[PDB]
Write a protein that binds this DNA or RNA. Structure first.
Ligand SMILES: CC(=O)OCC[N+](C)(C)C
Ligand SMILES: CC(=O)OCC[N+](C)(C)C
Lengths: 275, 275
DNA sequence: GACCCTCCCCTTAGGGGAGGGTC
DNA sequence: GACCCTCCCCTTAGGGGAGGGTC
Protein backbone atom coordinates (compact mmCIF):
# COMPACT_ATOMS: atom_id res chain seq x y z
CA UNK A 1 1.46 -3.45 -0.56
CA UNK A 2 0.00 0.00 0.00
CA UNK A 3 1.75 3.17 -1.36
CA UNK A 4 0.87 6.83 -0.89
CA UNK A 5 1.55 9.83 -3.14
CA UNK A 6 2.74 13.00 -1.45
CA UNK A 7 -0.87 14.28 -1.63
CA UNK A 8 -2.43 11.12 -0.23
CA UNK A 9 0.05 11.35 2.67
CA UNK A 10 -0.56 15.03 3.21
CA UNK A 11 -4.30 14.50 3.52
CA UNK A 12 -3.60 11.48 5.62
CA UNK A 13 -1.30 12.97 8.24
CA UNK A 14 -2.52 16.49 7.84
CA UNK A 15 0.83 17.81 6.81
CA UNK A 16 1.35 20.18 3.85
CA UNK A 17 2.84 18.89 0.66
CA UNK A 18 5.40 21.67 0.93
CA UNK A 19 6.18 20.42 4.42
CA UNK A 20 6.80 16.83 3.28
CA UNK A 21 8.92 18.00 0.33
CA UNK A 22 10.96 20.07 2.79
CA UNK A 23 11.31 17.30 5.34
CA UNK A 24 12.61 15.33 2.38
CA UNK A 25 15.17 18.07 1.54
CA UNK A 26 16.55 18.07 5.10
CA UNK A 27 16.54 14.26 5.21
CA UNK A 28 14.22 14.25 8.25
CA UNK A 29 11.49 12.26 6.57
CA UNK A 30 12.18 10.92 3.03
CA UNK A 31 9.75 9.00 0.79
CA UNK A 32 10.28 5.29 0.52
CA UNK A 33 10.57 5.63 -3.22
CA UNK A 34 11.23 8.25 -5.86
CA UNK A 35 10.31 7.53 -9.42
CA UNK A 36 13.51 8.36 -11.21
CA UNK A 37 11.61 9.43 -14.34
CA UNK A 38 9.11 11.79 -12.77
CA UNK A 39 10.80 12.66 -9.46
CA UNK A 40 7.47 11.72 -7.84
CA UNK A 41 7.49 11.01 -4.10
CA UNK A 42 5.84 7.83 -2.86
CA UNK A 43 5.52 6.60 0.71
CA UNK A 44 4.85 3.30 2.54
CA UNK A 45 2.01 2.90 5.01
CA UNK A 46 4.39 1.55 7.68
CA UNK A 47 6.46 4.75 7.29
CA UNK A 48 3.78 7.13 8.59
CA UNK A 49 4.66 6.12 12.13
CA UNK A 50 7.60 8.54 11.96
CA UNK A 51 5.44 11.61 11.50
CA UNK A 52 3.84 10.70 14.82
CA UNK A 53 6.99 12.02 16.48
CA UNK A 54 7.88 14.69 13.94
CA UNK A 55 4.41 16.18 14.44
CA UNK A 56 4.46 15.93 18.23
CA UNK A 57 7.94 17.43 18.45
CA UNK A 58 6.79 20.17 16.13
CA UNK A 59 3.85 20.97 18.40
CA UNK A 60 6.15 21.28 21.41
CA UNK A 61 8.26 23.51 19.23
CA UNK A 62 11.58 21.72 18.94
CA UNK A 63 13.60 22.84 15.90
CA UNK A 64 14.12 20.43 12.98
CA UNK A 65 17.79 19.50 13.37
CA UNK A 66 16.82 18.83 16.94
CA UNK A 67 14.14 16.33 15.85
CA UNK A 68 16.62 14.76 13.45
CA UNK A 69 18.75 13.69 16.38
CA UNK A 70 15.91 13.00 18.78
CA UNK A 71 14.41 10.40 16.44
CA UNK A 72 17.50 8.26 16.98
CA UNK A 73 17.00 7.92 20.75
CA UNK A 74 15.60 4.72 22.21
CA UNK A 75 12.75 5.06 24.72
CA UNK A 76 14.97 5.50 27.81
CA UNK A 77 17.12 8.06 26.04
CA UNK A 78 13.96 9.94 24.86
CA UNK A 79 12.21 10.10 28.21
CA UNK A 80 15.12 12.26 29.34
CA UNK A 81 14.78 14.55 26.34
CA UNK A 82 11.16 15.03 27.37
CA UNK A 83 12.07 16.09 30.89
CA UNK A 84 14.41 18.61 29.25
CA UNK A 85 11.61 19.96 27.19
CA UNK A 86 9.60 20.22 30.42
CA UNK A 87 12.05 22.49 32.25
CA UNK A 88 12.22 24.78 29.18
CA UNK A 89 8.45 25.02 29.28
CA UNK A 90 8.50 26.02 33.00
CA UNK A 91 11.17 28.60 32.18
CA UNK A 92 8.84 30.13 29.58
CA UNK A 93 5.86 30.03 31.97
CA UNK A 94 7.83 31.74 34.72
CA UNK A 95 8.98 34.44 32.31
CA UNK A 96 5.47 34.90 30.84
CA UNK A 97 3.64 35.26 34.16
CA UNK A 98 6.32 37.67 35.35
CA UNK A 99 5.52 39.54 32.15
CA UNK A 100 1.80 39.26 32.91
CA UNK A 101 2.28 40.97 36.31
CA UNK A 102 4.54 43.70 35.18
CA UNK A 103 2.14 44.76 32.53
CA UNK A 104 -0.84 44.77 34.94
CA UNK A 105 1.19 47.20 37.03
CA UNK A 106 2.41 49.23 34.07
CA UNK A 107 -1.30 49.64 33.31
CA UNK A 108 -2.17 50.46 36.95
CA UNK A 109 0.57 53.16 36.95
CA UNK A 110 -0.44 54.40 33.52
CA UNK A 111 -4.06 54.67 34.66
CA UNK A 112 -3.60 56.75 37.80
CA UNK A 113 -2.06 59.22 35.34
CA UNK A 114 -4.99 59.40 32.95
CA UNK A 115 -7.34 59.95 35.85
CA UNK A 116 -5.80 62.73 37.86
CA UNK A 117 -8.24 65.11 39.45
CA UNK A 118 -6.96 68.16 37.69
CA UNK A 119 -3.98 69.73 36.04
CA UNK A 120 -1.98 72.74 37.23
CA UNK A 121 -3.84 72.40 40.49
CA UNK A 122 -2.53 71.25 43.81
CA UNK A 123 -4.15 68.22 45.38
CA UNK A 124 -3.39 66.41 48.61
CA UNK A 125 -3.83 62.67 48.62
CA UNK A 126 -3.14 59.32 50.28
CA UNK A 127 -0.48 57.59 48.25
CA UNK A 128 0.72 54.04 48.01
CA UNK A 129 4.43 53.21 48.34
CA UNK A 130 6.64 53.14 45.20
CA UNK A 131 9.95 51.26 45.10
CA UNK A 132 12.71 52.80 43.04
CA UNK A 133 16.39 52.74 42.23
CA UNK A 134 18.15 56.03 42.74
CA UNK A 135 21.62 57.52 42.65
CA UNK A 136 23.35 60.72 43.75
CA UNK A 137 22.81 63.44 41.13
CA UNK A 138 26.13 65.19 41.23
CA UNK A 139 25.20 68.87 41.20
CA UNK A 140 22.60 68.22 38.58
CA UNK A 141 19.85 70.77 38.11
CA UNK A 142 16.62 70.44 36.12
CA UNK A 143 18.47 72.79 33.85
CA UNK A 144 20.99 70.29 32.49
CA UNK A 145 19.70 66.79 33.29
CA UNK A 146 20.04 64.37 30.41
CA UNK A 147 18.46 61.13 29.38
CA UNK A 148 22.07 59.93 29.13
CA UNK A 149 22.24 60.68 32.86
CA UNK A 150 19.88 57.81 33.54
CA UNK A 151 21.57 55.08 31.53
CA UNK A 152 23.13 53.03 34.36
CA UNK A 153 19.87 53.20 36.27
CA UNK A 154 18.02 52.12 33.17
CA UNK A 155 20.50 49.23 32.82
CA UNK A 156 19.72 47.69 36.22
CA UNK A 157 16.06 48.36 35.68
CA UNK A 158 16.19 46.70 32.25
CA UNK A 159 17.93 43.63 33.60
CA UNK A 160 15.45 43.18 36.49
CA UNK A 161 12.13 44.24 35.01
CA UNK A 162 13.03 43.64 31.38
CA UNK A 163 10.63 46.46 30.77
CA UNK A 164 12.18 49.97 30.61
CA UNK A 165 10.05 52.18 32.81
CA UNK A 166 8.64 55.14 31.09
CA UNK A 167 9.11 57.29 34.21
CA UNK A 168 12.00 59.54 35.04
CA UNK A 169 12.41 60.81 38.55
CA UNK A 170 14.56 63.22 40.48
CA UNK A 171 14.21 64.70 43.99
CA UNK A 172 15.29 67.94 45.66
CA UNK A 173 15.25 69.87 48.95
CA UNK A 174 11.95 71.63 49.58
CA UNK A 175 12.94 75.31 49.75
CA UNK A 176 11.48 78.79 49.12
CA UNK A 177 13.30 78.83 45.79
CA UNK A 178 13.07 82.01 43.79
CA UNK A 179 14.50 80.73 40.48
CA UNK A 180 15.34 77.54 38.65
CA UNK A 181 19.10 77.93 39.02
CA UNK A 182 18.89 77.86 42.79
CA UNK A 183 17.47 74.30 42.27
CA UNK A 184 19.74 71.24 42.33
CA UNK A 185 18.67 67.60 42.43
CA UNK A 186 19.76 65.47 45.30
CA UNK A 187 19.15 62.11 43.75
CA UNK A 188 17.65 60.97 40.48
CA UNK A 189 15.78 57.67 40.22
CA UNK A 190 13.58 55.31 38.28
CA UNK A 191 10.67 53.41 39.74
CA UNK A 192 11.29 49.67 39.91
CA UNK A 193 8.45 47.25 38.93
CA UNK A 194 9.75 43.79 39.81
CA UNK A 195 10.85 41.53 42.63
CA UNK A 196 13.39 39.58 40.61
CA UNK A 197 16.56 39.94 42.60
CA UNK A 198 18.59 42.63 40.89
CA UNK A 199 21.78 41.02 39.66
CA UNK A 200 25.16 42.19 40.74
CA UNK A 201 24.05 45.64 41.76
CA UNK A 202 26.78 48.25 42.40
CA UNK A 203 27.05 50.17 45.62
CA UNK A 204 26.34 53.53 44.07
CA UNK A 205 22.74 52.41 43.59
CA UNK A 206 20.38 52.73 46.46
CA UNK A 207 17.29 50.64 46.22
CA UNK A 208 14.81 52.58 48.25
CA UNK A 209 11.22 53.75 48.07
CA UNK A 210 8.85 56.69 48.01
CA UNK A 211 7.10 55.85 51.26
CA UNK A 212 3.34 55.54 51.56
CA UNK A 213 1.79 58.64 53.19
CA UNK A 214 0.07 61.95 52.48
CA UNK A 215 1.36 63.86 49.52
CA UNK A 216 0.68 67.38 48.34
CA UNK A 217 0.88 66.93 44.58
CA UNK A 218 0.48 68.71 41.26
CA UNK A 219 0.55 67.38 37.75
CA UNK A 220 0.60 69.11 34.41
CA UNK A 221 1.86 68.90 30.94
CA UNK A 222 5.29 70.32 30.27
CA UNK A 223 5.83 73.84 29.07
CA UNK A 224 8.77 75.87 30.36
CA UNK A 225 6.88 78.99 31.49
CA UNK A 226 4.72 76.60 33.52
CA UNK A 227 7.39 74.55 35.30
CA UNK A 228 8.54 76.97 37.87
CA UNK A 229 5.10 78.49 38.39
CA UNK A 230 3.65 75.11 39.31
CA UNK A 231 6.52 74.68 41.73
CA UNK A 232 5.60 78.03 43.28
CA UNK A 233 2.00 76.95 43.43
CA UNK A 234 3.07 73.99 45.57
CA UNK A 235 5.20 75.98 47.91
CA UNK A 236 2.33 78.36 48.34
CA UNK A 237 -0.26 75.64 49.05
CA UNK A 238 1.93 74.34 51.84
CA UNK A 239 2.89 77.76 53.12
CA UNK A 240 -0.78 78.78 53.47
CA UNK A 241 -1.83 75.62 55.34
CA UNK A 242 1.27 75.71 57.50
CA UNK A 243 1.54 72.07 56.64
CA UNK A 244 4.68 70.38 57.71
CA UNK A 245 6.87 68.73 55.02
CA UNK A 246 8.76 65.48 55.60
CA UNK A 247 10.46 64.48 52.30
CA UNK A 248 12.11 66.02 49.29
CA UNK A 249 10.08 67.13 46.35
CA UNK A 250 9.62 64.28 43.99
CA UNK A 251 9.57 65.13 40.33
CA UNK A 252 8.32 62.55 37.78
CA UNK A 253 8.47 63.05 34.05
CA UNK A 254 6.66 60.65 31.77
CA UNK A 255 6.15 61.03 27.97
CA UNK A 256 2.63 61.04 26.66
CA UNK A 257 3.61 59.49 23.35
CA UNK A 258 6.72 58.17 21.66
CA UNK A 259 5.93 59.29 18.15
CA UNK A 260 8.93 60.86 16.44
CA UNK A 261 6.37 62.17 13.96
CA UNK A 262 4.74 64.57 16.47
CA UNK A 263 5.88 67.35 18.87
CA UNK A 264 7.24 65.69 22.00
CA UNK A 265 5.03 66.16 25.06
CA UNK A 266 5.59 65.09 28.67
CA UNK A 267 3.68 64.80 31.94
CA UNK A 268 5.20 66.16 35.12
CA UNK A 269 4.18 65.39 38.68
CA UNK A 270 5.70 67.01 41.78
CA UNK A 271 4.79 65.18 44.97
CA UNK A 272 5.76 65.93 48.53
CA UNK A 273 4.94 64.27 51.81
CA UNK A 274 3.34 65.95 54.78
CA UNK A 275 2.11 65.03 58.25
CA UNK B 1 23.81 70.65 22.69
CA UNK B 2 24.73 67.02 23.23
CA UNK B 3 25.09 64.57 20.26
CA UNK B 4 25.76 60.83 20.24
CA UNK B 5 27.45 58.65 17.62
CA UNK B 6 25.81 55.32 16.85
CA UNK B 7 28.36 53.69 19.19
CA UNK B 8 27.85 56.13 22.04
CA UNK B 9 24.11 55.47 21.75
CA UNK B 10 24.54 51.73 21.56
CA UNK B 11 26.57 51.68 24.76
CA UNK B 12 24.12 54.10 26.24
CA UNK B 13 20.86 52.28 25.60
CA UNK B 14 22.38 48.87 25.38
CA UNK B 15 21.25 48.30 21.85
CA UNK B 16 23.52 46.89 19.11
CA UNK B 17 24.88 49.15 16.45
CA UNK B 18 23.43 46.75 13.90
CA UNK B 19 20.09 47.13 15.65
CA UNK B 20 20.12 50.93 15.46
CA UNK B 21 21.22 50.87 11.80
CA UNK B 22 18.32 48.50 11.12
CA UNK B 23 15.78 50.53 13.05
CA UNK B 24 17.00 53.35 10.85
CA UNK B 25 16.40 51.28 7.68
CA UNK B 26 12.79 50.52 8.68
CA UNK B 27 12.23 54.13 9.75
CA UNK B 28 11.33 53.05 13.30
CA UNK B 29 14.07 55.04 14.95
CA UNK B 30 16.20 57.35 12.73
CA UNK B 31 19.19 59.46 13.80
CA UNK B 32 18.59 63.15 14.22
CA UNK B 33 21.34 63.85 11.73
CA UNK B 34 23.30 62.11 8.99
CA UNK B 35 26.53 63.63 7.83
CA UNK B 36 26.02 63.71 4.11
CA UNK B 37 29.75 63.27 3.48
CA UNK B 38 30.40 60.27 5.69
CA UNK B 39 26.90 58.80 6.08
CA UNK B 40 27.61 58.84 9.83
CA UNK B 41 24.63 58.53 12.17
CA UNK B 42 24.30 61.04 15.00
CA UNK B 43 21.58 61.23 17.64
CA UNK B 44 20.17 63.82 20.10
CA UNK B 45 19.99 63.18 23.82
CA UNK B 46 16.27 64.08 23.89
CA UNK B 47 15.69 61.39 21.23
CA UNK B 48 16.67 58.42 23.42
CA UNK B 49 13.26 58.57 25.06
CA UNK B 50 11.87 56.68 22.06
CA UNK B 51 13.97 53.59 22.65
CA UNK B 52 12.29 53.38 26.05
CA UNK B 53 9.22 52.09 24.24
CA UNK B 54 10.96 50.32 21.38
CA UNK B 55 12.93 48.31 23.95
CA UNK B 56 9.94 47.56 26.18
CA UNK B 57 7.79 46.51 23.23
CA UNK B 58 10.66 44.36 22.04
CA UNK B 59 10.84 42.62 25.42
CA UNK B 60 7.13 41.82 25.31
CA UNK B 61 7.78 40.54 21.83
CA UNK B 62 5.70 42.75 19.58
CA UNK B 63 6.93 42.74 15.96
CA UNK B 64 8.54 45.88 14.50
CA UNK B 65 5.83 47.14 12.14
CA UNK B 66 3.59 46.71 15.14
CA UNK B 67 5.79 49.05 17.23
CA UNK B 68 5.89 51.50 14.34
CA UNK B 69 2.17 52.03 14.68
CA UNK B 70 2.00 51.69 18.44
CA UNK B 71 4.41 54.60 18.92
CA UNK B 72 1.79 56.89 17.42
CA UNK B 73 -0.86 56.16 20.08
CA UNK B 74 -1.51 58.66 22.85
CA UNK B 75 -1.62 57.31 26.42
CA UNK B 76 -5.34 56.36 26.38
CA UNK B 77 -4.99 54.66 23.02
CA UNK B 78 -1.86 52.76 24.28
CA UNK B 79 -3.33 51.50 27.52
CA UNK B 80 -5.74 49.51 25.38
CA UNK B 81 -2.92 48.07 23.29
CA UNK B 82 -1.39 46.87 26.55
CA UNK B 83 -4.54 45.06 27.61
CA UNK B 84 -4.41 43.38 24.20
CA UNK B 85 -0.90 42.27 24.80
CA UNK B 86 -2.11 40.91 28.16
CA UNK B 87 -4.75 38.57 26.74
CA UNK B 88 -2.20 37.22 24.22
CA UNK B 89 0.11 36.47 27.12
CA UNK B 90 -2.67 34.55 28.98
CA UNK B 91 -3.37 32.64 25.76
CA UNK B 92 0.29 31.56 25.65
CA UNK B 93 0.29 30.64 29.35
CA UNK B 94 -2.84 28.54 28.99
CA UNK B 95 -1.35 26.74 25.99
CA UNK B 96 2.04 26.24 27.72
CA UNK B 97 0.66 24.78 30.96
CA UNK B 98 -1.61 22.51 28.95
CA UNK B 99 1.59 21.45 27.22
CA UNK B 100 3.29 21.05 30.60
CA UNK B 101 0.58 18.58 31.76
CA UNK B 102 0.40 16.56 28.64
CA UNK B 103 4.08 15.93 28.67
CA UNK B 104 4.08 14.90 32.37
CA UNK B 105 1.52 12.29 31.37
CA UNK B 106 3.30 11.29 28.18
CA UNK B 107 6.24 10.62 30.49
CA UNK B 108 4.09 8.77 33.06
CA UNK B 109 2.73 6.54 30.23
CA UNK B 110 6.17 6.12 28.70
CA UNK B 111 7.57 5.10 32.07
CA UNK B 112 5.14 2.34 32.99
CA UNK B 113 6.38 0.83 29.73
CA UNK B 114 10.08 0.91 30.56
CA UNK B 115 9.39 -0.68 33.90
CA UNK B 116 7.23 -3.67 33.15
CA UNK B 117 7.83 -6.68 35.33
CA UNK B 118 8.78 -8.97 32.52
CA UNK B 119 8.40 -9.66 28.85
CA UNK B 120 6.61 -12.59 27.20
CA UNK B 121 5.23 -13.36 30.62
CA UNK B 122 1.70 -12.96 31.84
CA UNK B 123 1.12 -10.69 34.80
CA UNK B 124 -2.08 -9.72 36.57
CA UNK B 125 -2.30 -6.20 37.90
CA UNK B 126 -4.44 -3.34 39.21
CA UNK B 127 -4.76 -0.81 36.43
CA UNK B 128 -5.78 2.80 36.31
CA UNK B 129 -8.45 3.98 33.86
CA UNK B 130 -7.42 5.16 30.35
CA UNK B 131 -9.65 7.41 28.23
CA UNK B 132 -9.59 6.83 24.51
CA UNK B 133 -11.27 7.58 21.22
CA UNK B 134 -12.34 4.53 19.29
CA UNK B 135 -14.25 3.57 16.17
CA UNK B 136 -15.76 0.44 14.63
CA UNK B 137 -13.06 -1.53 12.81
CA UNK B 138 -14.99 -2.82 9.86
CA UNK B 139 -13.91 -6.44 9.59
CA UNK B 140 -10.35 -5.47 10.24
CA UNK B 141 -7.94 -8.13 11.41
CA UNK B 142 -4.43 -7.71 12.83
CA UNK B 143 -3.54 -9.12 9.48
CA UNK B 144 -4.38 -6.04 7.40
CA UNK B 145 -4.64 -3.08 9.78
CA UNK B 146 -2.95 0.04 8.49
CA UNK B 147 -1.59 3.20 9.95
CA UNK B 148 -3.80 4.88 7.35
CA UNK B 149 -6.68 3.20 9.18
CA UNK B 150 -6.11 5.47 12.15
CA UNK B 151 -5.96 8.82 10.40
CA UNK B 152 -9.38 10.24 11.39
CA UNK B 153 -8.79 9.15 14.96
CA UNK B 154 -5.39 10.76 14.87
CA UNK B 155 -7.04 13.94 13.51
CA UNK B 156 -9.36 14.41 16.50
CA UNK B 157 -6.57 13.45 18.82
CA UNK B 158 -4.22 15.95 17.17
CA UNK B 159 -6.75 18.76 17.42
CA UNK B 160 -7.49 18.11 21.13
CA UNK B 161 -4.14 17.06 22.55
CA UNK B 162 -1.98 18.71 19.90
CA UNK B 163 0.35 15.86 20.66
CA UNK B 164 -0.04 12.74 18.45
CA UNK B 165 -0.13 9.78 20.79
CA UNK B 166 2.46 7.22 20.10
CA UNK B 167 0.04 4.41 20.98
CA UNK B 168 -2.12 2.40 18.64
CA UNK B 169 -4.91 0.33 20.02
CA UNK B 170 -7.43 -2.22 18.86
CA UNK B 171 -9.73 -4.60 20.77
CA UNK B 172 -11.27 -8.00 20.06
CA UNK B 173 -13.53 -10.72 21.49
CA UNK B 174 -11.74 -12.99 23.93
CA UNK B 175 -12.02 -16.43 22.30
CA UNK B 176 -10.18 -19.77 22.14
CA UNK B 177 -8.74 -18.70 18.80
CA UNK B 178 -6.64 -21.25 16.97
CA UNK B 179 -5.15 -18.97 14.29
CA UNK B 180 -4.67 -15.33 13.42
CA UNK B 181 -7.25 -15.31 10.64
CA UNK B 182 -10.04 -16.27 13.01
CA UNK B 183 -9.21 -12.91 14.73
CA UNK B 184 -11.07 -9.71 13.83
CA UNK B 185 -10.94 -6.39 15.67
CA UNK B 186 -14.11 -4.97 17.05
CA UNK B 187 -12.96 -1.42 17.51
CA UNK B 188 -9.65 0.33 17.06
CA UNK B 189 -8.71 3.31 19.22
CA UNK B 190 -6.14 5.80 20.41
CA UNK B 191 -5.70 6.85 24.00
CA UNK B 192 -6.70 10.47 24.61
CA UNK B 193 -4.48 12.67 26.87
CA UNK B 194 -6.41 15.92 27.29
CA UNK B 195 -9.56 17.48 28.67
CA UNK B 196 -9.84 20.20 26.06
CA UNK B 197 -13.31 19.75 24.67
CA UNK B 198 -12.91 17.88 21.41
CA UNK B 199 -14.16 20.15 18.66
CA UNK B 200 -16.95 19.18 16.37
CA UNK B 201 -16.60 15.47 16.91
CA UNK B 202 -18.47 13.17 14.49
CA UNK B 203 -20.87 10.51 15.65
CA UNK B 204 -18.80 7.62 14.41
CA UNK B 205 -16.32 8.35 17.20
CA UNK B 206 -17.02 6.98 20.61
CA UNK B 207 -15.18 8.66 23.39
CA UNK B 208 -14.94 5.94 25.97
CA UNK B 209 -12.41 4.41 28.33
CA UNK B 210 -10.52 1.32 29.34
CA UNK B 211 -12.04 1.04 32.80
CA UNK B 212 -9.95 0.77 35.95
CA UNK B 213 -9.85 -2.82 37.28
CA UNK B 214 -7.80 -6.02 37.32
CA UNK B 215 -6.08 -6.91 34.10
CA UNK B 216 -4.29 -10.05 33.02
CA UNK B 217 -1.58 -8.60 30.80
CA UNK B 218 1.46 -9.48 28.71
CA UNK B 219 3.95 -7.27 26.97
CA UNK B 220 6.71 -8.04 24.54
CA UNK B 221 8.58 -6.77 21.60
CA UNK B 222 7.13 -7.50 18.21
CA UNK B 223 8.17 -10.48 16.17
CA UNK B 224 5.60 -12.39 14.11
CA UNK B 225 6.31 -15.92 15.41
CA UNK B 226 5.79 -14.44 18.88
CA UNK B 227 2.49 -12.61 18.39
CA UNK B 228 0.10 -15.45 18.36
CA UNK B 229 2.04 -17.48 20.92
CA UNK B 230 1.80 -14.67 23.46
CA UNK B 231 -1.91 -14.53 22.76
CA UNK B 232 -2.10 -18.26 23.48
CA UNK B 233 -0.11 -17.73 26.63
CA UNK B 234 -2.80 -15.33 27.83
CA UNK B 235 -5.68 -17.58 27.02
CA UNK B 236 -3.91 -20.33 28.86
CA UNK B 237 -3.20 -18.25 31.98
CA UNK B 238 -6.88 -17.46 32.26
CA UNK B 239 -8.03 -20.95 31.36
CA UNK B 240 -5.87 -22.48 34.12
CA UNK B 241 -7.06 -20.09 36.84
CA UNK B 242 -10.65 -20.35 35.68
CA UNK B 243 -10.62 -16.60 35.94
CA UNK B 244 -13.62 -14.87 34.58
CA UNK B 245 -13.13 -12.30 31.76
CA UNK B 246 -15.18 -9.10 31.50
CA UNK B 247 -13.83 -7.06 28.54
CA UNK B 248 -12.33 -7.52 25.12
CA UNK B 249 -8.66 -8.08 24.68
CA UNK B 250 -6.93 -4.78 24.42
CA UNK B 251 -3.96 -4.65 22.11
CA UNK B 252 -1.55 -1.66 22.27
CA UNK B 253 1.30 -1.14 19.86
CA UNK B 254 3.88 1.52 20.57
CA UNK B 255 7.17 2.09 18.65
CA UNK B 256 10.38 1.98 20.60
CA UNK B 257 12.12 4.45 18.33
CA UNK B 258 11.31 6.56 15.30
CA UNK B 259 14.66 6.31 13.58
CA UNK B 260 14.30 5.65 9.86
CA UNK B 261 17.97 4.72 10.05
CA UNK B 262 17.37 1.56 12.13
CA UNK B 263 15.17 -1.59 11.92
CA UNK B 264 11.69 -0.65 13.12
CA UNK B 265 10.78 -2.19 16.47
CA UNK B 266 7.51 -2.05 18.42
CA UNK B 267 6.14 -2.87 21.86
CA UNK B 268 2.92 -4.82 22.18
CA UNK B 269 0.71 -5.15 25.24
CA UNK B 270 -2.41 -7.31 25.44
CA UNK B 271 -4.55 -6.52 28.48
CA UNK B 272 -7.80 -8.05 29.60
CA UNK B 273 -10.03 -7.44 32.56
CA UNK B 274 -11.11 -10.03 35.08
CA UNK B 275 -13.12 -10.23 38.29
C1' DG C 1 -8.93 17.92 -15.28
C1' DA C 2 -6.39 17.10 -10.84
C1' DC C 3 -2.09 16.00 -9.09
C1' DC C 4 2.95 16.29 -8.90
C1' DC C 5 7.38 18.26 -10.12
C1' DT C 6 11.62 21.95 -9.51
C1' DC C 7 13.10 26.33 -8.97
C1' DC C 8 12.56 31.19 -7.38
C1' DC C 9 11.13 35.04 -4.29
C1' DC C 10 9.10 35.72 -0.12
C1' DT C 11 8.89 36.72 5.48
C1' DT C 12 11.84 38.15 10.76
C1' DA C 13 15.22 40.85 13.15
C1' DG C 14 19.16 41.35 12.84
C1' DG C 15 24.58 38.88 13.54
C1' DG C 16 29.09 38.37 11.38
C1' DG C 17 31.86 39.03 8.03
C1' DA C 18 35.03 41.60 4.34
C1' DG C 19 36.55 45.84 2.30
C1' DG C 20 37.07 50.76 2.87
C1' DG C 21 37.10 55.38 4.93
C1' DT C 22 37.71 58.41 8.97
C1' DC C 23 38.49 60.18 13.26
C1' DG D 1 44.38 52.76 16.53
C1' DA D 2 39.27 52.71 17.36
C1' DC D 3 35.10 53.85 15.34
C1' DC D 4 31.84 54.16 11.50
C1' DC D 5 30.27 53.18 6.85
C1' DT D 6 27.62 50.03 2.98
C1' DC D 7 26.85 45.89 1.00
C1' DC D 8 26.58 40.75 1.05
C1' DC D 9 25.59 36.07 2.93
C1' DC D 10 23.73 34.06 6.74
C1' DT D 11 19.68 31.61 9.89
C1' DT D 12 13.95 29.23 10.31
C1' DA D 13 10.35 26.45 8.37
C1' DG D 14 8.19 26.56 5.03
C1' DG D 15 3.95 29.43 1.90
C1' DG D 16 2.73 31.08 -2.69
C1' DG D 17 3.67 31.68 -6.94
C1' DA D 18 4.86 30.60 -12.20
C1' DG D 19 6.03 27.28 -15.68
C1' DG D 20 5.90 22.49 -17.04
C1' DG D 21 4.88 17.54 -17.08
C1' DT D 22 1.78 13.65 -16.01
C1' DC D 23 -1.79 10.93 -14.58
C1 LIG E 1 12.35 63.33 29.93
C2 LIG E 1 13.26 64.53 30.03
O1 LIG E 1 12.96 65.60 29.48
O2 LIG E 1 14.52 64.41 30.80
C3 LIG E 1 14.61 63.65 32.01
C4 LIG E 1 14.97 64.60 33.19
N1 LIG E 1 13.85 65.17 33.99
C5 LIG E 1 13.44 64.28 35.10
C6 LIG E 1 14.26 66.43 34.62
C7 LIG E 1 12.72 65.51 33.13
C1 LIG F 1 2.09 0.17 14.40
C2 LIG F 1 1.60 -0.88 13.45
O1 LIG F 1 2.35 -1.80 13.07
O2 LIG F 1 0.21 -0.81 12.95
C3 LIG F 1 -0.89 -0.39 13.79
C4 LIG F 1 -1.90 -1.56 13.94
N1 LIG F 1 -1.74 -2.47 15.12
C5 LIG F 1 -2.45 -1.95 16.31
C6 LIG F 1 -2.32 -3.78 14.84
C7 LIG F 1 -0.33 -2.71 15.40
Amino acid sequence: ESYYSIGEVSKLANVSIKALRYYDKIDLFKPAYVDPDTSYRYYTDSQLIHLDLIKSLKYIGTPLEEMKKAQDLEMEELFAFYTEQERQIREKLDFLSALEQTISLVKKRMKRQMEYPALGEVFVLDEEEIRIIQTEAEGLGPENVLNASYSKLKKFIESADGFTNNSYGATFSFQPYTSIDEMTYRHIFTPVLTNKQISSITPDMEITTIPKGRYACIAYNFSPEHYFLNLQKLIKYIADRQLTVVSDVYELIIPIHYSPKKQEEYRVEMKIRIL
